[PDB]
Design a protein around this ligand. Structure first.
Ligand SMILES: CCCCCCCCCCCCCCCC(=O)O
Ligand SMILES: CCCCCCCCCCCCCCCC(=O)O
Length: 115
């Protein structure tokens, strides 16, 4: 799995804070998110995740930004493996913006598991 650099860790925190504010995440929800308590997310947690993927440049208007995903994931996971996950996940649509982002994320997590 990803071993984030110190630069990436700092960016994660910046975008975390941006998305807690933008998606009106409660204090309790924010603490779940910070602790990676992602099971059965609430609606605002799904919006947080969608926001996060937007802010890191990987998702826009429900569309996966493939070059950015590859830039970020290929070095660790393998280019062909990431292209295969893109092929399988990038067209997923959910019930609304936030559910779409959540479902795409879940698909990528499944792809990671299948490694
Ligand atoms: C074929 C490979 C697919 C891999 C999919 C990996 C998805 C990575 C999602 C990571 C989100 C960012 C986590 C930040 C962790 C932290 O520093 O607190
Ligand atoms: C909508 C889901 C997309 C999932 C695949 C996206 C893979 C990128 C995961 C990168 C997580 C780490 C982010 C580091 C901080 C940063 O890039 O700003």
């Amino acid at each position: 799995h990803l071993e984030l650099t110190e630069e990436q860790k700092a960016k994660v925190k910046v975008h975390f804070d941006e998305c807690v504010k933008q998606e009106k995440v409660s204090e309790e929800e924010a603490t779940k998110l910070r602790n990676k308590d992602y099971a059965n997310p609430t609606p605002a947690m799904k919006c947080f995740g969608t926001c996060f993927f937007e802010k890191i440049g990987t998702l826009k208007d429900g569309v996966v930004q493939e070059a950015v995903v590859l830039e970020k994931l290929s070095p660790h996971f393998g280019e062909e493996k990431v292209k295969a996950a893109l092929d399988k996940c990038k067209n997923i649509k959910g019930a609304d913006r936030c559910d779409t982002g959540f479902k795409i994320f879940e698909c990528f997590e499944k792809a990671k598991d299948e490694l």
